[PDB]
Specification:
The structure is cut from a larger assembly and holds nine protein chains of nine kinds. By secondary structure, chain A is an alpha+beta fold. Chain A is built from three helices and three strands; from the N terminus they run H-E-E-H-E-H. In chain A, 7% of the residues are buried. Chain C is mainly β. Chain C is built from no helices and four strands. Chain E is mainly alpha-helical. Chain E has a two-stranded antiparallel ribbon. Chain E is flat, with a radius of gyration of 11 Å. Classes of the chains: A alpha+beta, B mainly alpha, C mainly beta, D alpha+beta, E mainly alpha, F mainly beta, G mainly alpha, H alpha+beta, I alpha+beta. Chains D and H meet through strand 3, helix 1 and helix 2 of D and helix 3, helix 4, helix 5 and helix 6 of H. Strand 8 of chain F pairs antiparallel with strand 11 of chain H. Bound molecules: magnesium ion (MG) (8 copies). The structure holds two RNA strands. Chain H: One of its GO terms (cellular component) is mitochondrial large ribosomal subunit. Chain H: InterPro entries: PEBP, PEBP-like_sf, PEBP_euk. Chain H: Belongs to the phosphatidylethanolamine-binding protein family. Mitochondrion-specific ribosomal protein mL38 subfamily. Chain H: It is found in: Mitochondrion.
Chain lengths: 95, 44, 55, 120, 50, 106, 51, 354, 122
RNA sequence: CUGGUGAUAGCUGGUUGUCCAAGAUAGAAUCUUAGUUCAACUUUAAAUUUGCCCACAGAACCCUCUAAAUCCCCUUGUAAAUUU
RNA sequence: CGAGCAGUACAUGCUAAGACUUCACCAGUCAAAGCGAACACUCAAUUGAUCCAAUAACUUGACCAACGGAACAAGUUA
């Protein structure tokens, strides 16, 4: 990670995180399952069902990905007809 | 469970499993039934 | 590690384009299965078209 | 909507029912019972009672078994029990006397398969 | 040996202390000592131990 | 030289524990605990609660299914009068299926 | 023992429950202290001098 | 550590010395019959019956019915034996029995069934419905006197009420035809109560019909203590059960306190408790007959609430408990995207301050 | 392996010869204990250290009063080798509201309600 | 020799006032075992309500039998525990 | 002492409560209800991430066996 760039002097973003993960504005990170396109002929339908689904990262992984991306990726966006629009805010969450 | 009073309640192996002829009982007897009729030997 | 079986692709005869991969013996004629097609929501005939890989 | 006692997968018979038709055929008598899941017996029909014994040449033949079902089917309708399960062994199912007992219950208006529980 | 145990004037015995865990003695004892009652130490037997 | 680790299989919910529908009760290599009332069994002999309630462990008479040849061949060779017992785990439901509530006065 | 297991049961439930509520009250009453305007002004006395 | 058993072991009586010369089961049915016998016996360990079996009081339940009839077994047995030999003597019956073509007349079988063992089956069936549990708080009685109750539907058909059969309120709109065997000079008391028909008090019951001091079988000549009221089970309230009670009176009784005006369309007066009513009349009255049926809601119930009862019809609905979800956590690890939908109330988009 | 110790129930059963040596009465058991720690929790298992804290016996040679009930006795039977147990004696009875400031626990286990610090005139 | 160059070093050595407080031994992966990452443990802040101790009851048959015990755990003694 | 399979299916379809988890993560496992059909396959292990490549899509590709895998590199020094 480049904490200070050589031309602007500002923190850079690791593009390997942007192409793999999605950040909900609430703070959650959404990823894919490792191996959902590999060797599907030898996997049971139950196994493939939980492979082609989107999951959330844990506390440590979410903290790691926040340090590897700048504030441009943590802002609130208002994309028109966004599939994940309703997931950007938590509901009835305590502590 | 071993410490419980009901230990070993499920045991079944001793129920199922767990020649020499003595002077009082004959060891093995072979009974031969010779007859010209096949049905008579099978029936007897 | 001799390849007894091969992986083949069954293409639906309903024209919907739905296809699935199944494993069949190498020394065997082309399969013609009766598999469920989600597009027409019923079981339709399928035909082997191309061998994918040798298992 | 009442829950059935699901489970007991490794043992026989099952308990996922509300009412069960249990047929007891002894050396001399033949008895059929309709009992609830909790063990309580709803209605009964046996060859030991004088009502059915006085009209049977033999209480241990197929005719006696078929006659019990015809008598029990009338009692099932009166009792309000219309659905019940039958859980025979593979040899009992293949037997001729149980086949006609099932026919008597079906012709009497009793269905030998309970409707599925409603969960939603 | 049975006579010695009965007429022993010592009020303290290995069996009583070991079983009741008096003084926390089980911390330096062994699980086998609960049955050996102090008469055995390794491969050696002590006939004089009551 | 083969290296392996424990499978962490055993009792997940003990006697008297409150469970919900779908909670796994026990994972077994072989049928150490048999499914009882309102207890299902998975592919890997995994016991899960089919209803929400209290888990109970009891000893019940083991009557195998007639189709199971190995188990039927075992009871037929038992001495007359012998009865097999095995440990069954049951879930005693705590809540009713539902209640009738007034919704309108028409 | 003075009492058996059955007699002892529930003989101290009220006091134990009340004792824990004190722990809950003390734990859930944690808050920053009050800030007084008198304390801010009392620092001006450091330059207090005679005439 | 080991603990000795608190009772005899299941297979303790079996001797292992001569295991080879011991009779086996050799069959699944022989083991199953023996297996069920021990499953119904008490055990010192935990069992299925302990947790799921219906708890009952160790005290024996009392019997408050008529005394059993006195029948000479020796004469009864001899007459039954003689009929069997005559039936088996005929060669036509044996030929029909061997050909599996003979059959019994079902109408004649029930005629003998209702006289010999019919009352005992009714008591067992009534206990299953828990009528004795609610009406008499567990007190039981044998319905020695059969009761025939049927509703006149149209002009040619009848709807009999035997024990718990389904009857619609439209068919039960009028007073049923009540017939039963009785001797002259005897006094009877008919009673119809709806245990589940009550709308406010679960324990209390609604009264539908009450006739007292009926001379013999002439039900019409009996006093009309309470006018007949059709069952009114609320819509969506399930299945209600109404019980017909036939009482035998030893001396004439005055039911002025239990009398109700004609008509009686007030549910406060229609409230009726069989346990308390029988408690003060048990000295001069003993139950003799029993009949009941199951009732659902139909269109005729709407007429009862609006026109007869002069009220709005209550509508019930079977409500299930809300689905259980664990406490929501800030970071749900390895949870699908649909995790957030489980804890979301509104399905429509939200915008907050914007 | 060293594990927790299960004391047999037979040990805690007073014999007839014990009542004539300690002066206890099985028919009238004492209501309260006087537990005093006389041994260090150091070099003892952690579960024995925890029970000492639960009984309020952090400081040694500091008498503490506990109720003679099975649940409390259960904890005492675990650390019975680290404590001294004596019954609480009340020759003058329970302290009153006017005697709270005049009580004194003697080494004999008696809790007197009149502590005058004056020689007996008798 | 100068410059890149303050090359790099998972290695060695060093790391400068006072006082108080909490505070030690499960593991996994790794061109890895002189290292690092995660977990566990530890610290601080916050929030919440149970935490520990534990009465019965309960936890498998086998290859024939056999240990100290452990898990679970209301009371009770206690004041912690969980979560952010 | 084994495993790097094979066999039977072709709804071995689609969806979805609650949980297990090889002490982390990755990965792995079970599953009621529901739609749609019929009237969560056997098997202790029987397996390989990302990038990339091929393809209209579907999907497939490593004794990457040094099996959490570097796209491709030996010997020797007295
Ligand atoms: Mg340097
Ligand atoms: Mg290193
Ligand atoms: Mg310190
Ligand atoms: Mg884990
Ligand atoms: Mg490597
Ligand atoms: Mg490796
Ligand atoms: Mg690994
Ligand atoms: Mg040289």
């Amino acid at each position: 990670l480049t904490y200070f760039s050589a031309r602007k002097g500002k923190r850079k973003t690791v593009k390997a995180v942007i192409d793999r993960f999605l950040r909900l504005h609430c703070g959650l990170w959404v990823r894919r399952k490792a191996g959902y396109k590999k060797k599907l002929w030898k996997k049971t339908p139950a196994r493939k069902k939980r492979l082609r689904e989107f999951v959330f990262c844990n506390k440590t992984q979410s903290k790691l990905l926040d340090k590897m991306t700048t504030s441009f990726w943590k802002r609130r966006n208002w994309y028109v007809d966004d599939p994940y629009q309703k997931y950007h805010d938590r509901t009835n969450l305590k502590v | 469970y071993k410490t419980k009073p009901t230990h070993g309640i499920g045991k079944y192996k001793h129920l199922i499993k767990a020649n020499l002829g003595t002077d009082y009982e004959y060891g093995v007897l072979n009974i031969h039934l010779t007859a010209y009729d096949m049905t008579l030997a099978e029936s007897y | 590690s001799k390849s007894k079986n091969i992986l083949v692709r069954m293409v639906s005869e309903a024209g919907t384009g739905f296809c699935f991969n199944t494993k069949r013996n190498r020394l065997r004629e082309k399969l013609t299965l009766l598999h469920y097609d989600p597009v027409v929501k019923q079981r339709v005939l399928f035909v082997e078209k191309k061998k994918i890989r040798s298992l | 909507v009442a829950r059935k006692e699901r489970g007991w997968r490794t043992v026989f018979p099952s308990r996922e029912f509300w009412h069960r038709l249990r047929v007891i055929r002894t050396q001399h008598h033949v008895e059929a019972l309709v009992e609830h899941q909790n063990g309580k017996v709803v209605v009964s029909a046996s060859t030991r009672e004088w009502a059915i014994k006085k009209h049977l040449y033999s209480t241990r033949n197929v005719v006696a078994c078929e006659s019990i079902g015809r008598v029990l089917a009338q009692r099932c309708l009166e009792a309000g029990i219309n659905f019940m399960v039958y859980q025979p062994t593979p040899w009992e199912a293949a037997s001729d006397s149980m086949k006609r007992l099932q026919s008597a219950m079906t012709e009497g208006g009793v269905v030998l398969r309970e409707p599925q529980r409603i969960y939603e | 040996q049975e006579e010695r145990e009965r007429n022993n004037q010592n009020p303290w015995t290995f069996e009583r202390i070991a079983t009741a865990n008096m003084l926390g003695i089980r911390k330096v004892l062994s699980p086998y000592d609960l049955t050996h009652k102090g008469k055995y130490w390794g491969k050696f037997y002590m006939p004089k131990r009551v | 030289g083969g290296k392996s680790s424990g499978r962490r299989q055993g009792i997940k919910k003990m006697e008297g524990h409150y469970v919900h529908a779908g909670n796994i009760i026990a994972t077994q290599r072989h049928f150490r605990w048999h499914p009882g009332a309102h207890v299902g069994v998975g592919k890997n002999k995994c016991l899960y609660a089919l209803e929400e309630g209290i888990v109970r462990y009891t000893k019940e008479v083991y009557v195998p299914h007639p189709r199971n040849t190995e188990a039927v061949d075992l009871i037929t060779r038992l001495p007359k009068g012998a009865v097999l017992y095995k440990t069954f785990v049951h879930v005693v439901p705590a809540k009713p299926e539902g209640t009738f509530k007034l919704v309108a006065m028409l | 023992p003075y009492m058996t297991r059955e007699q002892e049961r529930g003989h101290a439930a009220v006091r134990r429950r009340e004792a824990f509520e004190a722990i809950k009250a003390a734990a859930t009453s944690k808050f920053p202290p009050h800030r007084f305007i008198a304390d801010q002004l009392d620092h001006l006395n450091v330059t207090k001098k005679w005439s | 550590r080991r603990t000795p058993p608190l009772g005899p072991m299941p297979n303790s009586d079996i001797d292992l010395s001569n295991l080879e010369r011991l009779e086996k089961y050799r069959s699944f049915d022989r083991y199953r019959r023996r297996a069920e016998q021990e499953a119904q016996a008490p055990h010192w360990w935990r069992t299925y019956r302990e947790y799921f079996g219906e708890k009952t009081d160790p005290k024996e339940k009392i019997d408050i019915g008529l005394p059993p009839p006195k029948v000479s077994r020796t004469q009864q047995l001899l007459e039954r034996k003689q009929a069997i030999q005559e039936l088996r003597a005929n060669v036509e019956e044996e030929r029909a029995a061997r050909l599996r073509t003979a059959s019994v007349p079902l109408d004649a079988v029930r005629a003998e069934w209702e006289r010999t063992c019919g009352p005992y089956h009714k008591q067992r069936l009534a206990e299953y419905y828990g009528l004795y549990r609610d009406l008499f708080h567990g007190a039981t009685f044998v319905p020695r006197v059969p009761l025939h109750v049927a509703y006149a539907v149209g002009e040619d058909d009848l709807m009999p009420v035997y024990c718990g059969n389904e009857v619609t309120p439209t068919e039960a709109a009028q007073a049923p035809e009540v017939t039963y065997e009785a001797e002259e000079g005897s006094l009877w008391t008919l009673l119809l109560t709806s245990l589940d028909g009550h709308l406010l008090e679960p324990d209390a019951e609604y009264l539908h019909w009450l006739l007292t001091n009926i001379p013999g079988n002439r039900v019409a000549e009996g006093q009309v203590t309470c006018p007949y009221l059709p069952p009114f089970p609320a819509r969506g309230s399930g299945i209600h059960r109404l019980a017909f009670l036939l009482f035998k009176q030893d001396q004439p009784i005055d039911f002025s306190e239990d009398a109700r005006p004609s008509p009686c369309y007030q549910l406060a007066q229609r409230t009726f408790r069989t346990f308390d009513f029988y408690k003060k009349h048990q000295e001069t009255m003993t139950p003799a007959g029993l009949s009941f049926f199951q009732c659902r809601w139909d269109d005729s119930v709407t007429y009862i609430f609006h026109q007869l009862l002069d009220m709005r019809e209550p509508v019930f609905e079977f409500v299930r408990p809300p689905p259980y979800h664990p406490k929501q956590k800030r970071f749900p690890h390895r949870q699908p995207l649909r995790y957030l939908d489980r804890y979301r109330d509104s399905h429509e988009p939200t915008y907050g301050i914007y | 392996k060293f594990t927790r110790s299960r004391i047999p129930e037979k040990v805690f059963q007073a014999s007839p010869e014990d009542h004539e040596k300690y002066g206890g009465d099985p028919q009238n058991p004492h209501k309260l204990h006087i537990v005093t720690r006389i041994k260090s929790t150091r070099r003892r298992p952690y579960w024995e250290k925890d029970i000492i804290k639960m009984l309020g016996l952090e400081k040694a040679h500091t008498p503490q009063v506990h109720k003679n009930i099975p649940s409390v006795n259960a904890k005492l039977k675990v650390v019975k080798h680290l404590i001294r147990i004596k019954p609480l004696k009340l020759p003058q009875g329970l302290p009153a509201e006017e005697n709270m400031s005049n009580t004194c626990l003697k080494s004999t286990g008696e809790l007197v309600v009149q502590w005058h610090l004056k020689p007996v005139e008798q």
